[PDB]
């Protein structure tokens, strides 16, 4: 990614923010991938809630990553509110993915990414 | 829109929810349009914060409308948290658009739509 | 929606474009709803491809509607290319939803909306 | 990112695809960042078209990256069409960012990322 490079060249120009942006896109892609993999499983009926939570997590992580890419200045912003929402979403998604992690390696990877994004988003709210 | 029609045919099948979904997409489109119109104004330098807030509002309204389109059942969901975030975003965007409404009719229309979406999102959290 | 009202107040200021924008958001919401309803069906395993195509259609319709909301001027734009892609996507999604329409009323509604969006997007490329 | 790891664990389980997905998210974030930086410049009026093209590029790159994250199987997909559209979008955005690269380092970085994403998307269509 180019998050760090672009922040430094912004005319209104932060490690916690760079890490949060990176993780939001990483998590958005991973959740999209996890939902699609759950949809291909023989036992797809067992994974309905996990697919649904992945879909919401991918939507909220993209939104958060976009908002946070525009949060390099000092002006009022929705950033902290959005990051709290992303954190809560990632917490929910992680718990459900974690529950299937013994059965589906893709859900283990997704749960780990959601946990990391949750942590990153919380850290950026400081 | 087909929000009402699709909710009723959902196998896990609410006026406040239908109104919120409709308004989130209406507001997403209106904010996207408002940012683009502000970008075309002679006095674009005066509208920087308004463009930025429109961009964040369009992102959050789409996300909210998507999440709420999947919230027709009884299972745990990020819905209330997301709708509070949308409400707060629309409040911010409305205030800035409102400030330019005497000068730019497109900002008057956008402020009115943001106010309505804010109200709809708050009502759906009940 | 406020598409027509916002186009007329744009400083660079078209019926086919207003109809396309409206339909793209209508279709994005309807496909999101259809995927979520398919995920709740007893026979979810039979609907894997339909869910997947709905997810791609909702993503592409939002993108198209956003791009087209910014296409009110005369400058070079990705608009025609994006609308052709939306048309092709809606065609694919319609065919799969249509196949399940006798079994699931939500897929009948979605197929009808996808057909209309396809038509609208093609008309706006003129 | 976790693109490579998730592809390998997909029940329907490609270097060109992993590179395209990674680049689409990298480019989406970079274009979002570039538009926000152009909005903060003293000479924002000179950057209107660049901001607009960045906004469309961020929208199309996210959509492409999402679609391509679900393209790990053999079934019919919009993937090739979407990747051609992303390529064309990145080409347009690159040319405009490149034009400002002598004046704004953020536009130099964005033009380089758009060029790479364009190349990656074209390579994945093979
Ligand atoms: Cu997750
Ligand atoms: Cu999850
Ligand atoms: Cu997950
Ligand atoms: Cu995850
Ligand atoms: Cu607004
Ligand atoms: Cu606003
Ligand atoms: Cu506005
Ligand atoms: Cu507005
Ligand atoms: Cu469809
Ligand atoms: Cu469909
Ligand atoms: Cu459908
Ligand atoms: Cu449909
Ligand atoms: Cu670009
Ligand atoms: Cu560009
Ligand atoms: Cu750029
Ligand atoms: Cu770029
Ligand atoms: Na900002
Ligand atoms: Na739901
Ligand atoms: Na335009
Ligand atoms: Na697929």
Author numbering:
A (entry chain A), B (entry chain A), C (entry chain A), D (entry chain A): 1 to 13, 18 to 130
From the reporting publication:
The ability of bacteria to maintain appreciable amounts of intracellular copper has only recently been discovered. This is achieved by a family of copper storage proteins (the Csps), which are tetramers of four‐helix bundles possessing Cys‐lined cavities binding up to approximately 20 CuI ions per monomer. The twin‐arginine translocated Csps (MtCsp1 and MtCsp2) from the methanotroph Methylosinus trichosporium OB3b are involved in copper storage for the main methane‐oxidizing enzyme. This organism also possesses a Csp3 (MtCsp3), homologues of which are much more widespread and allow bacteria to accumulate cytosolic copper.
The crystal structure of MtCsp3 plus ca. 2 molar equiv of CuI (see Supporting Information6, 7, 13, 14, 15) has four partially occupied sites. These are Cu11 with an occupancy of 0.25, and Cu12, Cu13, and Cu14, all with occupancies of 0.35, which form a symmetrical tetranuclear cluster. Cu12 and Cu14 are bound by the Cys residues of CXXXC motifs, that is, from the same α‐helix, whilst Cu11 and Cu13 are ligated by Cys residues on different helices (Cu13 is also weakly coordinated by Asn 58). The thiolates of Cys 97, Cys 101, Cys 114, and Cys 118 bridge between two CuI ions (μ2‐S‐Cys). Additional stabilization is provided by CuI–CuI interactions (ca. 2.6–2.7 Å) between neighboring metal ions. There is no preference for CuI binding at a particular tetranuclear cluster apart from in the structure plus ca. 2 equiv, in which only Cu11–Cu14 is occupied. This must be due to the fact that as CuI ions diffuse past Cu15 to Cu19 at the mouth of the bundle, Cu11–Cu14 are the first sites they encounter at which they can form a tetranuclear cluster. The position of Cu11 in 2 equiv MtCsp3 corresponds to Cu11b in the 8  and 14 equiv structures, which is therefore bound before Cu11a. We identify [Cu4(μ2‐S‐Cys)4] as an intermediate for the three clusters that are made up of the first sites (Cu3 to Cu14) to be occupied in MtCsp3.
